[PDB]
Design a protein around this ligand. Structure first.
Ligand SMILES: Nc1ncnc2c1ncn2[C@@H]1O[C@H](COP(=O)(O)OP(=O)(O)OP(=O)(O)O)[C@@H](O)[C@H]1O
Ligand SMILES: [Mg+2]
Lengths: 113, 240, 1077, 13
């Protein structure tokens, strides 16, 4: 991310048959899979780099990244059940309490007597 | 004050300025010449230079009206073309980005008249007005500097009418869809030249104009160094 | 590395002393030695006889306090021929040219027979030395008159390295032997013979003044005085062995000077203790070892760069004060001992002399920090750091060098108060010879203990301390001193810690059944201010609590209380300069505004929370296209708005925060630009409709945007949150970016430069705007003082009528430079410190030939790599090739987000760009000539307004200060939103439109923020104009003039200025009042 | 007051 948060994202997609499709199966050729895999990898990299970790999570909740993948790969091959399967956090930067407090939105004590 | 006409042919038209408390007989001077142009929309016009701030047609209707009354001439200004005080309309971004919905100096404007009789009537009046500064400067007319358009311009932080806005978006979208639809049919309608040459159009092409622009925007590897008898001899010559 | 080496050579040759003056001084002091041989001997004398001997003479003996009294002066005095020798840098031929001048250290060894084995006790040796110097000065004076040289020499006593115990004679020349042009002064150092006193008795732990406490300072003076030639011989060997000794020596000398480091004493209060000698000795020590395993750290084959780097690295990484010290043998490999003496120690077992006694703990820590910082600069490969390391003086201004400065006026200052003087006592006199030394430590310990973690480094400077006095006097006489104390007043200089500078409570030792020693000192130190308190986590700790204020930091209150309690109840501590800067920041009209600190961003967060509520509503509504993301891009989302957000303060210009709304990618977007924009509005209509129906508490209205030229169909939806905040929504579409590029391509060759500018403004608002706010917000958390300084900087610009032309982002990019690139200084830790550093940068910025390129990253990735760095440099050179004079573009600000460098700094007229630099230069010059004070700060923030051709006075019908959220007030939005305009300032729109009409003839400027810079009521604003040179004079009449002109001849016209005021006035209507032309 | 005569040739640099 732009916050120097190193993370690994896993996407999963499936092929679907068209509305008028008569063939039992909807397999895609290996060229299509590589073409789709290239498009997905580009989108995932683009979204993460142009975003903070907080902004990245804000994208995961509405699942906007999945819909973006669907439109991009729509011309390659129809797809279904597109999801960001998993997100791993590999490395973290130096901890910054100031940034953490802002994400959560100091206190005088009480005299003991 | 004795100056009436500029030697290049621009007639001076002195105007009296308003009185404001901040400013306790200062004048504004306009320069005018007849415009000759074969173009119909630029025919029957008067070239003007050094316009006052925010000079619309309603301003010209007032001034020409005053001249008509003073010199009992009949003149009617049709419209005021090419009035770009702030240069907002110098370029038409709609025309550059596409042809659908748009088939298309500074501190100056062209004053159109209804007919040839009105323009020459105004000019004989205008020459007479220019003489006045030399003789009786008091009777010079006064520019109002306030009109209904001026108040609207002054009120910058005014919310737009949603009802007006909704209608404008509707008509424009309705018109655009008609034009977009017509263009797509035209390209994908089996265009055949007079000499039986069928144009090539790809699927998803929407405008013939785009086809023209894509056109404007847009052996060595198969050769063998050692295949013919002359070639290997050449290699032999260089080898030794 | 080759570039660095060639730069090193250029520096050495530039500062190399001219050899002619060496002959001149050598021609003199060689003759001076003959004079010293002429001086006769003297007999044994007691204090009574020498006092009578000197009673009538002009000369006076410079006896060191305590002066010898008849009872304890039983020992006798005598003079004999010394062993004259030359020492110092000049002996090593390592000197350089100094415009202020250098000094030649001549040593006169007193003969050994003048001393007894126990003469290092009770100042016995020092008093013998003093009369020896006085007798020499007496005879030197008469002989100087004899040879007719008195006409152009001035003789005065002085203290060696500001050491009160070692007076010396300083020979200086005024305007054949006249060496005035040489810029040299001969110093006569009266040292002792080597090993007269058993060095073991003179160790730092031992004592030599009977009263037992140790006397490290007294022991060093006598011992160092007896070891002078020996260290010359040691450095002489090292000079022969390594060929690069002298080159490294000058580099350290140049490095030390720029940081304000000298060999003078620091216990008095000045920053010093480390000079060319100490730097040379440390390097010599490292050439013979230095590692913990006694392995060589420096090799004799190293070059000048490598020798300097090793010494800098050794200082940076090894601790010599608290945990560890280094021992070497001058006459044996140097070894780093892990044990520490709690004071800087570079021990010399051969001579039993600690070379770093003159260095204080406080000064040493600052040395280590400076050494550490340059090591980082020295390893940097992307940027050249030669100029920062060697060619930048950071000691010119204390305020730029130190975050906060407090001057303490001690009481009764022709001697300090009896109670204050009584604290000195006799024990501390043995430990600390002078009260100035004693007072310096006293201020240091209490201030260090009181502030604790709130500060990083502390310096106690005795302002107005003199070190040279006439021959007729025995000690230095200060005007306030009356020969009692040698200083005017003391100044406490601090390097605050932004993370913990503003903590409300000072934590202390935890509670225990039996009160620990740490608990005792805490309660005793703080007295009534101390308390035992309990917190949410359940801990019981001794802590004292303070009160935050928006005018001054907590540190001002702590130092005042601590110093008064322990130093003197009558002390007066004052730092008004910081108070003025804090007050110049607008005070928000929120609850407890005055008690809020300047580092508190609660107001910004509240605006964010109201946004997050609206963020949820928009997403959940159903639209034809799903909402991809909502990105806030307003100023308040990166903590840069001049005046903090205030609910319902809609007169503020920055009330409506821009928000970029982006939908999912679709292929149904219109392909024509106006159709695309009208399609965008249609989506905003639906958002307003569903928002109005489902959430009626929100209010909304539509406004037009004309920022992007020629795109007149942009419509933005303004949402008025119930919390009292306004948000402006604009739709971003992927097709929009490529449509502009199409316009550029289809535009005619002459029009293409105009269209690319339109694209430049689009990318500045929609594409580049998102990136700017993201990075600046994240970075600002690490730089706590970035938000206040940029706000105050934008306040400084507005008063001088520059924000109208300087876009918001450009100001932030200039204001962040001292933080991301603090070299050679530190990161700002004060509002006063940060603002002045921005002004210092603009003053010395040669934007015609130097670009500004920034690494918007947190303190030590996104660091600019060498490839990216060179690429941006190439962009600058290409641009300057077409624009050498800088007319079209002036400021080149580039970074990762903006590699082009022209994104945020285009369109600024050259008159404005020079004005920004011209004001910055005058601000710095004003600070040099007159120090920072209340009057100067007011001059900084007052506009001249006399340079402009004509000046216009405006007044709004109603004051806007209250509706702008500024506390010297609306609590709901108007029922009819048309009433909003009634409480707005249009003069910003006034100048913008007039500039377009009079772009070719006039340049009009105005104050953007009328609430802040419009007087008490915030209703007065000013338009100031400038007439370009061409149209000021008459011009021949042509169609293309594009100027409002009046005829004079048939083909001559002149600027019809009188008409221009009418158009300005007619535009203003009631607002305009008065004109000055 | 903080006054500097306007420079239009960039001579201040
Ligand atoms: N900290 C010290 N410890 C021991 N001896 C010292 C110390 N500082 C100076 N001396 C002695 O004093 C002599 C002169 O000191 P001084 O600081 O004037 O030398 P320098 O480096 O040549 O000076 P400058 O920077 O003025 O050219 C040194 O040669 C050394 O004999
Ligand atoms: Mg010296």
């Amino acid at each position: 991310t732009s916050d120097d948060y190193v993370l690994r994202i896993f996407a999963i997609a499936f092929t679907r048959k068209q509305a008028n499709q008569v063939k039992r199966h909807s397999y895609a050729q290996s060229s299509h899979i590589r073409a789709i895999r290239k498009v997905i990898s580009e989108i995932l990299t683009k979204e993460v780099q142009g975003s903070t970790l907080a902004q990245l999570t804000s994208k995961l909740i509405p699942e906007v990244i999945n819909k973006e993948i669907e439109n991009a790969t729509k011309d390659i091959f129809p797809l279904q059940n597109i999801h960001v399967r998993k997100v791993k956090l590999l490395k973290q930067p130096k901890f910054d309490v100031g940034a953490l407090m802002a994400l959560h939105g100091e206190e005088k004590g009480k005299k003991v007597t | 004050e004795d100056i009436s006409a500029m030697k290049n042919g621009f007639i001076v038209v002195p105007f009296k300025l308003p009185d404001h408390k901040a400013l306790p007989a200062s004048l504004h001077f306009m320069f005018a010449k007849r415009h000759q142009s074969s173009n119909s929309n630029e025919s029957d016009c008067l070239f003007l230079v050094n316009l006052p701030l925010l000079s619309n047609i309603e301003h010209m209707k007032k001034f020409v009206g005053q001249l008509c009354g003073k010199y009992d001439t009949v003149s009617h200004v049709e419209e005021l073309l090419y009035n770009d005080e702030f240069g907002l309309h110098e370029v038409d971004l709609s025309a550059l980005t596409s042809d659908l919905m748009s088939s298309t100096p500074r501190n100056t404007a062209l004053l159109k008249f209804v007919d040839a009789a009105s323009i020459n009537n105004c000019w004989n009046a205008l020459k007479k007005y220019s003489n006045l500064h030399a003789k009786h400067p008091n009777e010079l007319f006064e520019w109002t500097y306030t009109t209904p358009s001026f108040t609207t311009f002054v009120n910058f932080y005014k919310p737009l009418d949603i009802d007006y806005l909704k209608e404008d978006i509707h008509t424009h979208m309705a018109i655009f869809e008609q034009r977009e639809a017509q263009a797509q049919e035209d390209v994908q309608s089996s265009i055949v030249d007079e000499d039986g040459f069928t144009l090539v159009v790809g699927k998803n092409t929407k405008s013939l104009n785009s086809i023209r622009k894509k056109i404007l925007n847009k052996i060595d590897k198969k050769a063998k160094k050692d295949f013919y008898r002359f070639q290997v001899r050449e290699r032999k010559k260089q080898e030794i | 590395s080759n570039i660095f080496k060639l730069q090193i050579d250029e520096l050495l040759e530039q500062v190399k002393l001219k050899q002619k003056h060496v002959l001149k001084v050598e021609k003199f002091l060689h003759k001076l030695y003959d004079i010293l041989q002429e001086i006769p001997d003297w007999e044994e004398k007691s204090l009574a006889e020498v006092d009578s001997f000197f009673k009538n003479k002009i000369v006076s003996v410079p006896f060191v306090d305590p002066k010898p009294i008849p009872q304890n002066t039983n020992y006798k005095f005598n003079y004999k021929k010394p062993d004259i020798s030359l020492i110092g840098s000049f002996a090593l031929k390592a000197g350089i040219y100094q415009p202020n001048g250098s000094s030649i250290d001549t040593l006169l060894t007193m003969p050994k027979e003048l001393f007894e084995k126990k003469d290092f006790l009770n100042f016995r040796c020092l008093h013998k030395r003093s009369v020896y110097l006085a007798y020499l000065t007496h005879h030197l004076l008469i002989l100087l008159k004899k040879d007719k040289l008195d006409s152009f020499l001035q003789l005065e006593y002085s203290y060696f390295d500001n050491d009160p115990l070692l007076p010396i004679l300083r020979i200086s020349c005024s305007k054949d032997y006249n060496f005035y042009k040489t810029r040299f002064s001969i110093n006569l150092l009266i040292g002792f013979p080597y090993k007269v006193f058993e060095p073991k008795k003179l160790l730092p732990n031992r004592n030599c003044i009977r009263i037992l406490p140790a006397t490290p300072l007294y022991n060093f003076s006598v011992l160092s005085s007896s070891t002078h030639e020996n260290y010359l011989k040691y450095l002489y060997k090292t000079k022969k062995q390594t060929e690069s000794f002298v080159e490294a020596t000058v580099l350290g000398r140049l490095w030390l000077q720029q940081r304000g480091f000298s060999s003078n004493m620091s216990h008095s209060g000045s920053l010093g203790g480390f000079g060319t000698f100490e730097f040379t000795i440390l390097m010599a020590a490292l050439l013979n070892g230095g590692g913990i395993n006694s392995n060589k750290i420096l090799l004799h084959g190293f070059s000048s760069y490598q020798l300097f780097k090793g010494v800098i690295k050794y200082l940076a990484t090894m601790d010599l004060c608290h945990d560890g010290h280094l021992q070497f043998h001058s006459n044996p490999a140097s070894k780093y001992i892990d044990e520490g003496f709690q004071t800087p120690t570079l021990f010399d077992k051969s001579t039993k002399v600690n070379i770093l006694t003159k260095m204080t703990v406080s000064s040493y820590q600052i040395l280590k920090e400076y050494a550490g910082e340059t090591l980082r600069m020295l390893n940097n490969v992307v940027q050249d750091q030669f100029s920062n390391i060697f060619l930048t003086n950071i000691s010119r201004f204390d305020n730029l060098k130190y975050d906060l400065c407090y001057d303490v006026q001690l009481p009764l200052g022709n001697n300090l108060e009896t109670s204050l003087a009584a604290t000195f006592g006799s024990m501390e006199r043995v430990k600390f010879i002078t009260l100035e030394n004693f007072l310096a430590h006293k201020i240091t310990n209490v201030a260090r203990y009181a502030l604790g973690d709130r500060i990083k480094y502390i310096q106690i400077e005795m302002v107005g301390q003199k070190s040279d006095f006439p021959i007729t006097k025995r000690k230095v006489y200060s005007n306030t001193g009356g020969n009692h104390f040698n200083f005017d007043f003391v100044r406490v200089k601090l390097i605050v810690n932004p993370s913990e500078c503003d903590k409300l409570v000072t934590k202390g030792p935890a509670h225990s059944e039996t009160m620990s020693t740490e608990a005792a000192v805490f309660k005793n130190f703080w007295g009534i201010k101390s308390s035992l308190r309990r917190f949410k986590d359940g801990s019981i700790t001794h802590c004292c609590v303070w009160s935050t204020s928006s005018s001054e930091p907590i540190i001002s209150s702590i130092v005042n209380f601590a110093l008064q309690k322990h130093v003197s109840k009558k002390a007066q501590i004052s730092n008004e300069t910081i108070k003025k800067f804090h007050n110049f920041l607008p005070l928000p009209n929120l609850p407890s505004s005055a008690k809020t600190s300047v580092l508190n961003l609660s107001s910004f967060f509240n605006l964010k929370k109201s946004f997050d509520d609206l963020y949820k509503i928009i997403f959940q509504m159903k639209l034809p296209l799903s909402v991809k993301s909502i990105l806030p891009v307003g100023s308040a989302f990166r903590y840069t708005s001049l005046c903090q957000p205030v609910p319902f303060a809609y007169s503020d210009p920055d009330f409506f925060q821009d928000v970029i709304l982006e939908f999912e990618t679709s292929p149904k977007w219109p392909d024509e630009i106006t159709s695309l924009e009208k399609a965008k509005t249609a989506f905003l209509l639906k958002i307003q409709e569903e928002l109005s129906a489902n959430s009626s508490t929100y209010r909304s209205f539509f406004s037009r945007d004309e920022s992007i030229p020629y795109n007149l169909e942009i419509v933005t939806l303004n949402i008025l949150t119930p919390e009292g905040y306004g948000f402006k929504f604009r739709v971003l579409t992927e097709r929009d970016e490529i449509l502009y590029l199409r316009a550029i391509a289809n535009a005619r060759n002459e029009l293409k430069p105009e269209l690319e500018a339109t694209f430049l403004k689009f990318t500045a608002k929609y594409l580049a705007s998102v990136r700017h706010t993201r990075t600046l917000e994240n970075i600002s958390h690490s730089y706590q003082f970035y938000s206040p300084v940029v706000r105050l900087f934008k306040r400084w610009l507005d008063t001088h009528l520059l924000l109208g032309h300087i876009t918001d982002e450009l100001a932030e990019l200039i204001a962040i430079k001292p933080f991301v690139d603090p070299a050679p200084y530190f990161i700002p830790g004060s509002l006063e410190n940060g603002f002045l550093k921005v002004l210092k940068f603009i003053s010395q910025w040669n934007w015609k030939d130097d670009p500004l390129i920034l690494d918007l990253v947190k303190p030590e990735s996104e660091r600019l790599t060498l490839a990216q760095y060179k690429g941006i440099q190439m962009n600058f050179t290409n641009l300057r090739n077409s624009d050498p004079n800088g007319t079209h573009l002036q400021f080149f600000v580039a970074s990762k987000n903006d590699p082009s460098g022209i994104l945020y700094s285009s369109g600024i007229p050259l008159p404005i760009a020079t004005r920004l630099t011209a004001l910055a230069k005058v601000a710095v010059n004003l600070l040099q000539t007159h120090g920072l004070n209340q009057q100067t700060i007011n001059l900084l923030f007052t506009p001249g307004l006399k340079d402009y051709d004509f000046v216009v006075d405006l007044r709004t019908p109603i004051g806007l200060k209250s509706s702008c959220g500024i506390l010297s007030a609306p609590s709901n939005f108007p029922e009819n939103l048309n009433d909003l305009s009634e409480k707005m300032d249009p003069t910003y729109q006034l100048v913008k439109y007039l500039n377009l009409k009079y772009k070719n003839s006039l340049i009009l400027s105005s104050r953007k923020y009328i609430g802040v810079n419009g007087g008490e009521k915030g209703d007065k604003n000013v338009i100031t104009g400038l007439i370009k040179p061409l149209f000021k004079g008459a011009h021949k009449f042509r169609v293309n003039l594009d100027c409002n002109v009046k005829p004079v001849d048939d083909e001559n016209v002149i600027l019809n200025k009188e008409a221009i005021f009418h158009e300005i006035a007619a535009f203003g209507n009631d607002m305009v009042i008065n004109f000055e032309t | 007051s903080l006054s500097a005569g306007f420079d239009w040739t960039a001579s201040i640099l």
